[PDB]
Write a protein that binds this ligand. Structure first.
Ligand SMILES: [Mg+2]
Ligand SMILES: [Mg+2]
Ligand SMILES: [Mg+2]
Ligand SMILES: [Mg+2]
Ligand SMILES: [Mg+2]
Ligand SMILES: [Mg+2]
Ligand SMILES: [Mg+2]
Ligand SMILES: [Mg+2]
Ligand SMILES: [Mg+2]
Ligand SMILES: [Mg+2]
Ligand SMILES: [Mg+2]
Ligand SMILES: [Mg+2]
Ligand SMILES: [Mg+2]
Ligand SMILES: [Mg+2]
Ligand SMILES: [Mg+2]
Ligand SMILES: [Mg+2]
Ligand SMILES: [Mg+2]
Ligand SMILES: [Mg+2]
Ligand SMILES: [Mg+2]
Ligand SMILES: [Mg+2]
Ligand SMILES: [Mg+2]
Ligand SMILES: [Mg+2]
Ligand SMILES: [Mg+2]
Ligand SMILES: [Mg+2]
Ligand SMILES: [Mg+2]
Ligand SMILES: [Mg+2]
Ligand SMILES: [Mg+2]
Ligand SMILES: [Mg+2]
Ligand SMILES: [Zn+2]
Lengths: 127, 155, 24, 80, 60, 118, 98
RNA sequence: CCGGGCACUCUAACGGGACUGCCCGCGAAAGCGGGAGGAAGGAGGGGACGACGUCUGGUCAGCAUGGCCCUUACGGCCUGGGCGACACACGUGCUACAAUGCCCACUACAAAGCGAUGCCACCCGGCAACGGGGAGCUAAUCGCAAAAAGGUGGGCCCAGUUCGGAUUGGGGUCUGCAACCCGACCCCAUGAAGCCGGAAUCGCUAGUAAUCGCGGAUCAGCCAUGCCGCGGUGAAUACG
């Protein structure tokens, strides 16, 4: 009937709700391509369905909030793959060599006192 | 890298051609962290090269990069006072970085107005064996075979 | 650019409003 | 670009002093430490010693200079 | 600073604009945090001592 | 096409070709193209003399312009310079007026760097 | 409507205070909604480490105001019976609005 | 938005979780190489944390303090001026020299904070800074608020320009007893140098550099381009 995964990337979450359907994807009450599309990276979110050839099987409804859009895409990528494994746990062995089910733990490195931006040091003269 | 080998960064396959060399080229185009703009430059240049020439831009991009790969270059080495321009080979990883960076830095030296026009035109010339990028490659291998007299300093 | 105060961009750089960057 | 927007400000020190000097006719030099104030038309023709911080400088006030402030005519620094 | 310059305490300042911060503990003129009423130095000295409730070390 | 005192912008859009008038920036050009009912995008070479004569009517006598402006500015300097004004003293010695610092970076107002010894 | 606003600098004094209130109101009142945790207000202060510069050595401190909500639904007496003055915690502070 | 529900996102407290524990190889061992499982592996990433001591380092001008001087005065009050001076020199930054760009309209996705005489939605006047009116908020419930780069559409067509916003004339708002020395902000006009920088030299090894905005501390106001934080997009390269 329905399968779910959460997915997260860089202070951004996007809950993926999978239902068997024509292949049409809604994101925040907008068309998938009316939200994205002006962004070349957008197709990455959907790569889990091409790894299992789940293209024409599922419809998806997503709720994406937080962060910027490019991180929103990666969270959708995971949430899609998470709902995919809960659907058929035999897809773990399929999806895992690609890493689609791993979380990207890289977040903005905090700024540190004495530097300009958290690594970049102020330039000096000595003379 | 004093300690380790400092392994290579593994680039993500191209979103379009599934090709890592594409992404690596797109990155050299990207400035100020705009990967979105850099792709739209590259892909809108793929339409120029495929219309103004009835040939697949995939094989031309490959063929252009190959013609700019230097087989040898010159390096300095501190010897007996002032140093020397010493010829030696180019590891195949460095042939990649140079030829890619050379294509991009050449295209921006071009006369054409819009970005993707310069890229596609430079690419088209580079595969054909001409254009500014192939001159940097043909000029480097001219440094070697010129200072060839120091081929015993190989290091 | 960010220097011209009679452009929208030079208005957001100073953090002010005017004819070249109204509120709503 | 200069702005007081209304109630063009003048110090109460000289104001009550000058308006009384009109009713008795133009007087000689006047001591003033308040250059904060603007100039008003009823100063024209007078002589006012404005403080630069060190001395009192005689300033003949005329019709052309009605808009400004005192001390615009009594500079502070001294260069070369 | 000087005991005379703790005249801000007695302000009756004749102009509100002449009210200035004046760290209370040490009589510092310049850098006075307003929520504590201390100066940046008296703030660190009282924080370490533990006399400022809720004020811990900052780490993240 | 001569609108103000002798002034001949050409071949470009009309609003932008008005910038080439002294007393006209982008705010005055957009205003004249608005109040004279002219498309700002039309090329200067494609301007109707009936539109051009309407433009000359407007701009010539609405605001003080090119010739008079230069004299009005200078006579507005001599004004504060002839009186003992402080602002006038700075205009004499070629220094900033709006209250900037001169210890460095006075370059635009004054005499690109003339160096001495130490 | 019975609102109870718990605020304190220590996060163990609020919890020591909030749990005690649910246990006195769950013997009488309906299912109390629960100890719902509200976000924290974090005031930060950054101070140069010494006097008289060495500008680039500052160490910062933070003062965190933790918040909690209570919301007993329809409490009458044996709720308010144990709620007059039985609480221990000190760094805690409470308000009531209806 | 209501009814209603806690599952989800979240919030903020308690826990679990990774240990070379499992497999192969080497090794005497410690461990090194590689592999599966796993959100994560050999210090997962980032902080706070800086030993015996060194430099007679820095500060008696934050405070404390030994000695020495001053005592109608080195002290005390005020107004005014100065800390902003300008023939030059260095440091650190900001904005740029443009088309991977500038401008205009339209439209989309943050994290972290601040606010009771303050934050001020919203309405009216004003080109606008802003003024009047006035709602809500002791604030996950209201407000700062619009995030910007981005996307779609359109304009400029390589030019000291629709690049660049210095300088200067002119009109005006606000704070403040008061803006001459000496403030910020708005509107009109002016539209400078500058077409990627000599010798030399600086930063960073991954969410890093680069770039884009946002907030805060002090503060009536502000010369904040500073500083301390926040997230958005997101590289190149390391033979040695
Ligand atoms: Mg950043
Ligand atoms: Mg610094
Ligand atoms: Mg230093
Ligand atoms: Mg501009
Ligand atoms: Mg001299
Ligand atoms: Mg003392
Ligand atoms: Mg003050
Ligand atoms: Mg000159
Ligand atoms: Mg000259
Ligand atoms: Mg000369
Ligand atoms: Mg000497
Ligand atoms: Mg500092
Ligand atoms: Mg760790
Ligand atoms: Mg650690
Ligand atoms: Mg010493
Ligand atoms: Mg100073
Ligand atoms: Mg209006
Ligand atoms: Mg709430
Ligand atoms: Mg709510
Ligand atoms: Mg609440
Ligand atoms: Mg366009
Ligand atoms: Mg020039
Ligand atoms: Mg221009
Ligand atoms: Mg040019
Ligand atoms: Mg390092
Ligand atoms: Mg402020
Ligand atoms: Mg200034
Ligand atoms: Mg700021
Ligand atoms: Zn103090």
């Amino acid at each position: 009937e329905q399968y779910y995964g959460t997915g997260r990337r860089k202070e951004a979450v996007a809950r993926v709700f999978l239902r068997p359907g024509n292949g049409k994807v809604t994101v925040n009450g907008q068309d998938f391509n009316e939200y994205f599309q002006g962004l070349v990276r957008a197709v990455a979110a959907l790569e889990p369905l091409r790894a299992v050839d789940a293209l024409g099987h599922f419809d998806a409804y997503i709720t994406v909030r937080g962060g910027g859009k490019s991180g929103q895409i990666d969270a959708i990528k995971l949430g899609i793959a998470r709902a995919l494994v809960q659907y058929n746990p035999d897809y773990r062995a399929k999806l895992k060599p690609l890493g689609f089910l791993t979380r990207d733990a890289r977040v903005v490195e905090r700024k540190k006192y004495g530097k300009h931006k958290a690594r970049r040091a102020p330039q000096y003269s000595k003379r | 890298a004093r300690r380790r080998r400092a392994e290579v960064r593994q680039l993500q396959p191209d979103l379009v051609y599934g090709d890592v060399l594409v992404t690596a080229f797109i990155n050299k185009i990207m400035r100020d962290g705009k990967k979105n703009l850099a792709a739209r430059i590259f892909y809108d240049a793929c339409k120029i090269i495929q219309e103004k020439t009835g040939q697949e831009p995939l094989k031309v991009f490959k063929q252009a990069v190959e013609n700019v790969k230097p087989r040898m270059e010159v390096r300095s080495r501190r010897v007996g006072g002032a140093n020397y321009q010493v010829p030696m080979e180019v590891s195949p990883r460095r042939q990649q970085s140079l030829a890619l960076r050379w294509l991009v830095q050449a295209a921006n030296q071009r006369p054409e107005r819009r970005a993707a026009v310069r890229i596609a035109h430079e690419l088209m010339d580079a595969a054909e064996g001409k254009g500014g990028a192939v001159k940097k490659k043909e000029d480097v291998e001219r440094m070697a075979e010129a200072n060839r007299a120091y081929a015993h300093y190989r290091w | 650019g960010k220097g011209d105060r009679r452009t929208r961009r030079g208005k957001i750089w100073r953090g002010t409003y005017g004819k070249y960057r109204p509120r709503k | 670009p200069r702005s007081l927007k209304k109630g063009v400000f003048v110090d109460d020190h000289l104001l009550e002093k000058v308006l009384e000097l009109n009713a008795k006719g133009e007087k000689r030099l006047i001591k003033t430490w308040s250059r904060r104030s603007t100039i008003v038309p009823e100063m024209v023709g007078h002589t006012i010693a404005v403080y630069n911080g060190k001395q009192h400088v005689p300033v003949y006030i005329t019709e052309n200079m009605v808009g400004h402030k005192l001390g615009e005519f009594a500079p502070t620094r001294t260069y070369r | 600073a000087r005991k005379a310059l703790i005249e801000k305490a007695k302000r009756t300042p004749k102009f509100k604009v002449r009210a200035y911060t004046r760290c209370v503990r040490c009589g510092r003129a310049r850098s006075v945090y307003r929520f504590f009423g201390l100066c940046r130095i008296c703030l660190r000295e009282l924080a370490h001592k533990g006399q400022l409730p809720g004020v811990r070390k900052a780490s993240w | 096409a001569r609108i103000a005192g002798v002034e001949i912008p050409r071949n470009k859009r009309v609003d932008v070709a008005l910038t080439y008038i002294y007393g006209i920036g982008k705010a005055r050009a957009k205003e004249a193209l608005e109040k004279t009912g002219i498309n700002p995008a039309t090329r200067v070479k494609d301007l109707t003399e009936a539109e051009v004569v309407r433009l000359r009517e407007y701009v010539e006598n609405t605001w003080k312009l090119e010739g008079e402006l230069r004299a009005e500015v200078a006579a507005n300097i001599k004004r504060l310079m002839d009186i003992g004004c402080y602002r006038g003293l700075r205009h004499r010695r070629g220094l900033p007026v709006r209250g900037q610092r001169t210890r460095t970076n006075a370059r635009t107002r004054k005499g690109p760097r003339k160096t001495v010894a130490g | 409507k019975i609102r109870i606003k718990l605020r304190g600098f220590d996060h163990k004094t609020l919890d020591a205070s909030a749990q005690k209130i649910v246990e006195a109101a769950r013997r009488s009142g309906a299912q109390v909604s629960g100890p719902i945790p509200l976000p924290t207000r974090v005031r930060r202060f950054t101070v140069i480490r010494g006097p008289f510069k060495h500008k680039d050595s500052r160490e910062h401190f933070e003062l965190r105001t933790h918040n909690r909500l209570v919301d007993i639904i329809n409490p009458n007496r044996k709720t308010i019976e144990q709620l007059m003055t039985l609480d221990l915690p000190t760094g805690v502070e409470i308000e009531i609005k209806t």
